[PDB]
Design a protein around this ligand. Structure first.
Ligand code: NI
Ligand code: NI
Lengths: 128, 128
């Protein structure tokens, strides 16, 4: 609870929220991702990727180009603050990261890098 | 141009038009679908499927449930007036159907049934 949050990304190409705020008291923060649905990861794969608003675009465009083998994320991309695995239906994955990696007054974005999904599957994250 | 429309499906999950006018003087109308870009069928597949605005949702839902091998279309869906195959990048397909299958004052939709795309890839077709 509190320094964790649960996200689901479904077969309708959406996330159950478009805003997460990290509380300034958290030492670490967890994002638990699940995929309700029936569709396979090769058609409707979802991951949770975090970065700044200004970088999102770069991360999606190089993610795309990497492909399904690299879970559509450029390996060791330094713009990526934290990311889960690309999961399909019935799969579950989570990531914990240092709240120290986030600074106040900066717009972060959570999104999915599977092609075309960030048009809908995106959200703001903010450290309050 | 004359009783036919050239249309494009791109890797941004966008068709290059969102309104088709079919002329009453046509015996037939031909739609010519192409897919500029680089992503394959299993990731950014596109088809042009036509039905009444009312049947669209049943076609989209059942299409999803038909699977990738079925080109995400319920085969012999009684509601589909015409459709192309689901094409990936570099590919192309056309469909010619008779104009008598359309009537005056019905609302028709064209759309793509690939998972999550029709919220974005959709337009109106109209008999004038
Ligand atoms: Ni996704
Ligand atoms: Ni499509």
């Amino acid at each position: 609870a509190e320094c964790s949050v649960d996200i689901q990304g479904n077969d309708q190409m959406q996330f159950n929220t478009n805003a997460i705020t990290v509380d300034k008291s958290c030492k670490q923060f967890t994002v638990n991702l699940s995929h309700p649905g029936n569709l396979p990861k090769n058609v409707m794969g979802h991951n949770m990727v975090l970065s700044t608003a200004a970088d999102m675009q770069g991360v999606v465009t190089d993610g795309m180009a990497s492909g399904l083998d690299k879970d559509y994320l450029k390996p060791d991309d330094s713009r990526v603050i934290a990311h889960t695995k690309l999961i399909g239906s019935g799969e579950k994955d989570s990531v914990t990261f240092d709240v120290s990696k986030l600074k106040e007054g900066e717009q972060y974005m959570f999104f999915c890098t599977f092609p075309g999904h960030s048009a809908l599957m995106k959200g703001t994250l903010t450290l309050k």
